[PDB]
Design a protein around this ligand. Structure first.
Ligand SMILES: *[C@@H]1O[C@H](CO)[C@@H](O[C@@H]2O[C@H](CO)[C@@H](O)[C@H](O)[C@H]2NC(C)=O)[C@H](O)[C@H]1NC(C)=O
Ligand SMILES: *[C@@H]1O[C@H](CO)[C@@H](O[C@@H]2O[C@H](CO)[C@@H](O)[C@H](O)[C@H]2NC(C)=O)[C@H](O)[C@H]1NC(C)=O
Ligand SMILES: *[C@@H]1O[C@H](CO)[C@@H](O[C@@H]2O[C@H](CO)[C@@H](O)[C@H](O)[C@H]2NC(C)=O)[C@H](O)[C@H]1NC(C)=O
Ligand SMILES: *[C@@H]1O[C@H](CO)[C@@H](O)[C@H](O)[C@H]1NC(C)=O
Ligand SMILES: *[C@@H]1O[C@H](CO)[C@@H](O)[C@H](O)[C@H]1NC(C)=O
Ligand SMILES: *[C@@H]1O[C@H](CO)[C@@H](O)[C@H](O)[C@H]1NC(C)=O
Ligand SMILES: *[C@@H]1O[C@H](CO)[C@@H](O)[C@H](O)[C@H]1NC(C)=O
Ligand SMILES: *[C@@H]1O[C@H](CO)[C@@H](O)[C@H](O)[C@H]1NC(C)=O
Ligand SMILES: *[C@@H]1O[C@H](CO)[C@@H](O)[C@H](O)[C@H]1NC(C)=O
Lengths: 216, 164, 95, 323
């Protein structure tokens, strides 16, 4: 709903498109005005040079018309080629986003826009395309004491995915991009090395799923 | 607008420390353009220089907001013109502000102008961003508890109007 | 300096942002001519004896001043032409 | 460039003739402004992707990694990391000569000191906050617990770093040191930048020297070409100057357009790296430079940017029978 309010009053967000349409009609205009310029010849009307003078003179003048206009094309043309490539690279980027963002999920960061990317919805626009990027942005944070490792018996325990945290007493392992604390058991943690090497390992007890299951 | 021994030119004649060889006449520069000259009637080494030149630039809020404008003379010293001297040139009609806000109308070399305060066009050193200092300690981690899902429009050209 | 922006923009509503409009060229206050006779045109042009074309006389002339005025004020001369020379700037010219 | 002046110096005579070519004079400014505008858009896209300016904490404990090399130097008047000074010395009259004829060098919107604040921010958040500052509010995380992730990114289980940390510290630091001499002892590393700056100053020289060419006219001084010539004949002469010079601009302008379109492509490559490589961790093989990529450190350089890619290259092999 916010998108439609933005567009309702936003002329600028389409500036990229509106500029492209402009710049063409601009050079198109200027291309036309160049038909009114003398270019040094006695007039910018083709015939009015003729009927004024006997043609063996007009052959001279019409040069300065042709030499002028022919140039003004090659200016305009060479523009378009350059401008075409500018769109060309933009079109390649659109194909890349259309391919990767919409048809996939882009692991690339900030290629589909700020935040982790979920999906995109393309929308046509005159001489262009408009993606609606649906991105996952985290919000509320809480300062946590953390440790890279946890001793148990002298073995070291590291999280499979996520990190050991605590709110100051009970050590919890949680996934990284969302706060979802879970008690620390072997299914959370794998064993490597021992307690000497790690810098920052703390003293704790990693609960065991299996041990209670025995006791009967 | 000077003529020295048939050499003509228009510039700002100043004293200069560059030292000719005696027989020489014109100093020059990488562009072959006349640079230094020697006053014939009394030998002295005069520099030369361009006039103020630069472009005029009209800094304005939208004509929808105000009809007031602040003129920027680019790359000049403020003589030959409420005046303020900038890095980018001689600015006129915008009150300097020691405060620093987001860059709004980009001018040059960090100077960015905005309309708000009665009101007058101002000019100030653009603050790049708001400032933050992350509170960091080797055991300190901050894990987000909640999220948003934002939809950010992104817009790209694809094709342009075909012509022949 | 504001109205020129409307002409450059070609729109009675000039939207926000900076516009280059014109240029100013500081004009110079005055001229410095810093130089560090008469040229014998009464001896050349009123001369009594010109040679022919097989042995034409040549006179290198320098270090004097040009009386280019009465050249045009003479007006008894049949064919008087100049290539790359301007009569108004002839006095100004420093050969 | 000032088209009317560059073509016709201080002469209304020539200036009036230029009007007969119409919009050439104006459309050149419209062309160059398009360049000049997006240049500060390039520098905008690349460097400032970050909402806030972060700054490093007062005290540096990263677990042994020494960033005093790459972090802003608190004792310089313009605060720029020790490395960046090596760069600004390598890269480099043309100061007013061009500015004689209407060839102007406009100041880049962002001063170098500002560029060094961005590349401080991006580098301040990268160190403290991991990669999360590109996705939202920066999240302080222990740097040594950052590098446990960036190994999981490349498939090396984090138990390698928690055990090898001290070693990895030295390899990092000793790697940073050689970056100094790599720059310090050889001036060809910056050629890419150096080539850009030269080619710009190149064409300007060429563009200036075109003022001194006859182009078929009797002289290259517009005064002698127009004032000395009859107000009737000198017209045709000044054409050959104008036609020559006016063409000679379109040559220069077209070059800039083409050349800018290259930079415009290179800028996106940076903005792509800056976003993916610096702000995130790249899975694209050899996009961030040879090896598995861990993190990247942006560093500013004149009209350019320099990345320090910290990459993970395996070393010693042991033949194993596998199944
Ligand atoms: C940190 O979080 C743990 C997990 O909830 C808290 O432990 C619980 O605290 C509540 C307090 O209302 C008790 O009712 C539960 O019995 C506790 N459970 C366990 C397993 O300890 C702990 O109190 C929190 N500490 C802080 C400082 O936030
Ligand atoms: C965790 O527990 C271990 C013992 O299992 C502690 O190691 C000893 O700590 C005492 C002080 O309480 C020292 O006097 C001993 O010298 C330590 N061990 C040895 C062999 O020197 C450890 O300090 C505790 N804290 C940790 C490591 O997180
Ligand atoms: C990071 O490295 C810098 C130099 O690369 C260290 O600065 C040096 O500190 C020693 C102190 O033992 C001085 O003798 C040197 O003169 C310093 N050199 C420079 C260039 O400043 C710095 O101490 C290191 N810091 C950390 C945390 O590793
Ligand atoms: C975490 O601690 C810092 C210390 O300055 C504080 O500014 C911040 O607000 C704390 N986090 C939260 C969520 O309050
Ligand atoms: C973390 O830093 C503090 C300094 O504030 C220090 O006392 C402590 O030993 C450090 N711990 C580790 C694991 O580096
Ligand atoms: C612009 O001006 C028109 C009147 O010309 C007015 O109706 C409109 O509200 C204005 N919009 C803004 C954004 O100032
Ligand atoms: C302007 O001129 C003053 C003295 O006339 C001088 O102190 C100052 O540095 C000059 N500034 C510039 C930018 O030329
Ligand atoms: C900014 O403060 C200085 C004093 O530190 C003062 O001289 C100057 O006038 C102030 N600027 C403005 C625009 O008031
Ligand atoms: C593995 O065997 C091949 C056999 O040619 C040899 O080239 C290679 O060096 C061996 N690997 C090691 C680590 O020695």
């Amino acid at each position: 709903g916010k998108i439609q309010d933005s567009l309702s009053s936003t002329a600028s967000a389409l500036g990229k498109l509106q500029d492209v349409v402009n710049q063409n009609a601009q050079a198109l205009n200027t291309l036309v005005k160049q038909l009114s310029s003398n270019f040094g010849a006695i007039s910018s009307v083709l015939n009015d040079i003729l009927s004024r003078l006997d043609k063996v003179e007009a052959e001279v003048q019409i040069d300065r018309l042709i030499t002028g206009r022919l140039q003004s094309l090659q200016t305009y043309v060479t523009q378009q080629l350059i401008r075409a490539a500018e769109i060309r690279a933009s079109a390649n980027l659109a194909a890349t986003k259309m391919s990767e963002c919409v048809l996939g999920q882009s692991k690339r960061v900030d290629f589909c826009g700020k935040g982790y990317h979920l999906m995109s919805f393309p929308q046509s626009a005159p001489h262009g395309v408009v993606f609606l990027h649906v991105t996952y942005v985290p919000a509320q944070e809480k300062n946590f004491t953390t440790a890279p490792a946890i001793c148990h018996d002298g073995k070291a325990h590291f999280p499979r995915e996520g990190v050991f945290v605590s709110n100051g007493t009970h050590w919890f392992v949680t996934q990284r991009n969302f706060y979802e604390p879970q008690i620390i058991t072997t299914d959370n943690t794998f064993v490597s090395g021992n307690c000497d090497v790690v810098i920052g390992i703390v003293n704790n007890t990693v609960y065991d799923p299996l041990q209670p299951e025995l006791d009967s | 607008n000077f003529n020295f021994n048939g050499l003509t030119g228009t510039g700002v004649l100043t004293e200069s420390n560059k030292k000719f060889l005696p027989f020489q006449q014109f100093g020059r520069d990488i562009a072959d353009t006349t640079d230094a000259v020697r006053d014939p009637q009394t030998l002295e080494i005069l520099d030369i220089t361009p006039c103020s030149f630069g472009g005029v630039s009209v800094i304005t809020p939208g004509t929808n907001t105000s009809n007031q404008v602040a003129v920027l003379y680019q790359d000049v010293n403020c003589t030959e013109v409420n005046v303020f001297q900038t890095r980018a040139g001689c600015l006129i009609g915008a009150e300097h502000v020691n405060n620093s806000y987001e860059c709004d109308i980009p001018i040059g070399a960090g100077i960015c102008a905005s309309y708000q305060t009665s009101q007058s066009i101002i000019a100030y050193t653009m603050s790049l961003g708001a400032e933050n200092s992350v509170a960091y300690s080797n055991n300190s981690i901050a894990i987000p508890t909640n999220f948003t899902i934002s939809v950010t429009t992104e817009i790209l050209p694809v094709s342009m109007t075909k012509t022949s | 300096p504001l109205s020129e922006t409307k002409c450059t923009l070609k729109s009675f509503t000039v939207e926000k942002g900076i516009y280059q409009t014109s240029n100013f060229r500081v004009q110079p206050t005055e001229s410095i001519v810093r130089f560090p006779n008469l040229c014998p045109f009464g001896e050349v042009f009123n001369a009594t004896r010109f040679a022919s074309v097989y042995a034409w006389n040549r006179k290198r002339i320098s270090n004097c001043v040009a009386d280019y005025s009465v050249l045009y004020n003479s007006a008894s001369f049949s064919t008087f032409k100049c290539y790359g020379v301007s009569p108004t700037k002839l006095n100004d010219l420093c050969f | 460039v000032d088209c009317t002046m560059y073509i016709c110096g201080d002469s209304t005579e020539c200036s009036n003739l230029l009007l007969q070519y119409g919009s050439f004079c104006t459309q050149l400014n419209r062309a160059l402004t398009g360049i000049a505008v997006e240049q500060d858009k390039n520098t905008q896209e690349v460097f400032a992707q970050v909402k806030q300016i972060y700054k490093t904490p007062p005290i540096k404990d990263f677990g042994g990694f020494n960033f005093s090399q790459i972090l802003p130097d608190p004792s310089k008047p313009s605060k720029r990391s020790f490395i960046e000074d090596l760069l600004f010395n390598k890269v480099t009259d043309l100061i007013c000569a061009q500015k004689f004829n209407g060839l102007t060098v406009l100041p880049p919107l962002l001063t170098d000191e500002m560029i060094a604040q961005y590349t401080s921010a991006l580098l301040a958040g990268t160190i403290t906050s991991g990669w999360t500052f590109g996705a939202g509010a920066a999240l302080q995380i222990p740097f040594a617990m950052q590098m446990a992730y960036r190994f999981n990114g490349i498939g090396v289980t984090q138990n390698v770093l928690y055990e090898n940390q001290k070693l990895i510290a030295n390899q990092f630091n000793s790697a940073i040191g050689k970056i100094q001499d790599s720059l310090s002892s050889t001036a060809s590393a910056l050629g890419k930048l150096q080539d850009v700056v030269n080619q710009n100053a190149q064409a300007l020289n060429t563009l200036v020297k075109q003022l001194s060419s006859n182009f078929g006219a009797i002289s290259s001084v517009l005064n002698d070409i127009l004032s000395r010539l009859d107000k009737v004949e000198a017209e045709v002469q000044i054409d050959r100057l104008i036609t020559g010079r006016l063409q000679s601009l379109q040559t220069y302008v077209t070059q800039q357009l083409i050349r800018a379109a290259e930079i415009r492509a290179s800028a996106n490559l940076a903005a792509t790296k800056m976003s993916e490589c610096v702000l995130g961790q790249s899975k694209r093989v050899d996009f961030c430079g040879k090896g598995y990529h861990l993190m990247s450190f942006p560093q500013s350089a004149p009209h350019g940017v320099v990345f320090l890619h910290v990459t993970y290259v395996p070393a010693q092999e042991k033949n194993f029978t596998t199944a």
